[PDB]
Symmetry: C3
Subunit: 376 residues, 3 copies
């Protein structure tokens, strides 16, 4: 049999479908990561974080030497998935395998195209299969593997011994997003350009020593003009049940609400203390631009690296750039531009279109040495 | 053949026998490590260091959802092995393979149960086989492997391609204790609750530039009321032979004396300098409790992390615990409790039973800012 | 088939040919690395950096217990290869495989002999095959692999599933020098004791924002009494072509000049700015000694760790050595010895032969606290 000595014939066709994704051995990085071709039309799947800090996305296909510009079809930050599009025909495509028919001990190979100058393949097994308790993806097998997963092959393919895609490599002993979930996500992203999720409007924490005397999710904040606000949910409410089913923690509440649609009607059990109250309400419901300055929104993750700051965070400033001698550094926060108060990346971009090339005043905060004005 | 594509059918039965061991995806750690079921009676083998800092040992079996309390059958700190017991019948058991019939290049898989929510399996080969020169375990193959060995699977199983146990994973490219040694050790531990070893009573160092003009073990300390003390062995004695066989270094002396029984008669050749002298003598011969404060004895390893300190070392103090606001920190040393002078963990425990719940005065040393009194 | 359960029979003969290389489990390091026996005459191949800081090279063969002194047949620092010789017959030799007939996904095993007390083998696949654009080794496949490559097995063997050498392990997910290149290099090193390469005499940098308005290599320095100096090449010359073929960068210029012989005639296109000029010229054209003090030449790599320093760098000084109490430290620079001005290791050695054992004055610089005189 071929596999006594090599797996090359089993994986060679899959290798053809794993592309590199870049911006702007050796110098060619500037490399963002890998992607996988899924349709002959030119659709490619990758991680969200691979293309997160990049406009002008460039794709390198095995045996091409030519970079193709890609446009962002859609993103899903919760699943860390994204679909981009290039204009070309008769492309090699990956063949999907059923990710619920894989077992611990199956041979798998992780394929990446780290720099657009060839593939890199690592060999291992399915080490563990992890099903979350809850949500629309309750029974999806998230894949651990001892095939090396790394930023080189993040966004690339994780294939079985017959060359079928069982997952999308995700780097941040190795994790892969299962291929059934990937198929469904890319189908929703080619349509609709997004994943529509319900939104309640509450910040959440778990119970430690409160006797509330139950389990559930403690409401620590109620966003203004939200369904939770308009329904009458207050801070310190313990959300215990959704539609008559208990939520043990904020994880289950998050995934059950997120598995629901916008404008969908939902009912919640809450403990003020300790009188059960019932609420019935309608559910409601952030990529940034690059340049040489980049910015990003202050997500709860971002302000961790700080509440109540408003505006964008200048994530990185490359050296000797036309925006570094202006005065921009890393970790600053753009709070005002001329007459537009910057509270998010959208405000940033709207301010940028108005009066571009014209003189422009930024009020930008530094955590140390602070508020300074930059005339760009 | 099955192994062209997967090893699952070959390892699935072995996976059933690898349990998780815990105390007190996600929160469930509090995880100590893995263990292996070896008898249908309910005996489980693991590393000593997995259960070292834990009373109230809890065991999670694959496909159970129910934690079973385990009692400590026995420990062996030199071999880093331990046997615990749970009350259950018709358990799945591991099948042992002969660890002296394995070869470099054999396929092996390391199985752990890191958090009690499923197995984790890594694949590799036997990378190296290491036999020590000396002792009762002279010809046991200690196993290196490029199957990943880590705290997740430490104490778990290392199996061959047919699912037979070839070793017990040990984390501290991967090391495993051979299965023949494990079988013998667990057999001695189910009986006797311990591994009986002879004790001489000397601290030892090797030769560097002494011309003693030989090889052997330099005696740097003679413990009081020990066979070496009562036989007339002095500091700076060079122990060169045991029962007419040369010892090259303190390693060989350690393993030859430790391979002997308590109350066993032994003869030693020594060089005062350089007149050979002969001694004939009878050989002679430490787990701690937890709580939220833990303590441990000051082993020669422990005071390295300091001679001549006496008493326990408070290894860790968890945050916001009822014993942290008392004043206990990490790295302190409890030297006195009321009228009991604490010289070991046994003194600590004996002091604790007397007057528990009653007011209690600790004299505890800090390496900086030092002696302080805590009224618990 | 054998490979469903083990690869031992396929690799056992290759393991016999992988030796350990040392100087001067446990104490036996003092270990430099691994090597591979390639001829029954006693020729062994290894990395240059394994034997770089060592005279008195000792070789341990599997199943020997006897160390054999080795003499340095030849070195090639650019390819990080070296050939040494021991006196013994009927040795086990490695069998070469064609390194241009390997594929990504082929099974490979990395064999080392890290401490001379047995082999260590790691398993993986060919992860990537990397061909440089240019030079005599344009089409040699440099091998990446997820078989672990590490200082233990650096200089050892990388073999296919049939036991044939496909590369020499190189540590500094794992890199191996292809076996065809290794065969050619060792053949040139057994003859000639070296790899003869052409030399131009220019320091080089790439283009960033110069509009030169081309691609090529910028000359930043012209060594005195060199072919470039005598031909009339000046600083800031842009070397664009060699023998009518364009060089994109200093990498291509380096490899095309280095692929040429000493005394070979070559023509170059240069841009002063922007008038093309043509030059035609003849091409022209460093291991150190150890002791307890070591020294090395100030290569451009070495002064990075500083231009224009002249003399040797004392790389390391072992503790309590007869040369440490003299005053030698790490990072100092020996600039003068008695009447010999030390500008390289050759000057160092020539100074050492004159008046050895006689009183001897070193003028040695320290980057801090600086010039001090040592009377050895």
């Amino acid at each position: 049999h071929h596999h006594h000595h090599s797996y090359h014939d089993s994986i060679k066709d899959s290798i053809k479908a794993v592309v590199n994704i870049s911006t702007e051995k050796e110098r060619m990085e500037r490399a963002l990561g890998s992607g996988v071709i899924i349709s002959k039309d030119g659709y490619i799947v990758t991680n969200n974080h691979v293309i997160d800090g990049a406009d002008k996305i460039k794709v390198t296909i095995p045996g091409s030497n030519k970079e193709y510009s890609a446009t962002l079809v859609g993103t899903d930050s919760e699943s860390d998935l994204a679909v981009i599009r290039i204009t070309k025909d008769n492309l090699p495509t990956i063949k999907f395998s059923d990710s619920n028919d894989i077992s611990v001990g199956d041979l798998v190979f992780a394929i990446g195209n780290p720099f657009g100058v060839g593939e890199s393949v690592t060999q291992g097994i399915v080490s563990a299969l992890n099903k979350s308790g809850i949500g629309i993806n309750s029974y999806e097998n998230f894949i651990q593997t001892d095939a090396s997963i790394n930023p080189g092959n993040s966004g690339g393919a994780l294939i079985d011994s017959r060359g079928g895609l069982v997952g999308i490599n995700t780097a941040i002993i190795g994790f892969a997003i299962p291929s059934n979930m990937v198929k469904d996500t890319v189908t929703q992203l080619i349509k609709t350009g997004k994943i529509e999720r319900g939104y309640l409007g509450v910040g959440l924490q778990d119970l430690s020593g409160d006797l509330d005397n139950k389990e559930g999710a403690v409401v620590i904040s109620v966003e203004k003009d939200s369904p939770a606000k308009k329904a009458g949910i207050l801070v310190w409410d313990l959300i215990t049940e959704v539609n008559g089913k208990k939520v043990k923690n904020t994880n289950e509440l998050r995934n059950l609400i997120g598995s629901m649609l916008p404008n969908q009607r939902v009912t919640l059990k809450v403990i003020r203390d300790k009188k059960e109250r019932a609420f019935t309400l309608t559910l409601a419901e952030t990529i940034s631009a690059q340049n040489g300055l980049q910015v990003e929104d202050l997500t709860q993750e971002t302000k961790r690296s700080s509440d109540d700051v408003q505006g964008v965070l200048v994530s990185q400033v490359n050296e000797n750039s036309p925006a570094e001698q202006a005065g921009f550094r890393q970790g600053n926060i753009i709070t005002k531009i001329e007459e537009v108060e910057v509270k998010s990346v959208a405000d940033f971009n709207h301010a940028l279109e108005k009066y571009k090339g014209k003189p422009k005043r930024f009020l930008v905060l530094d955590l140390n040495q602070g508020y300074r004005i930059i005339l760009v």
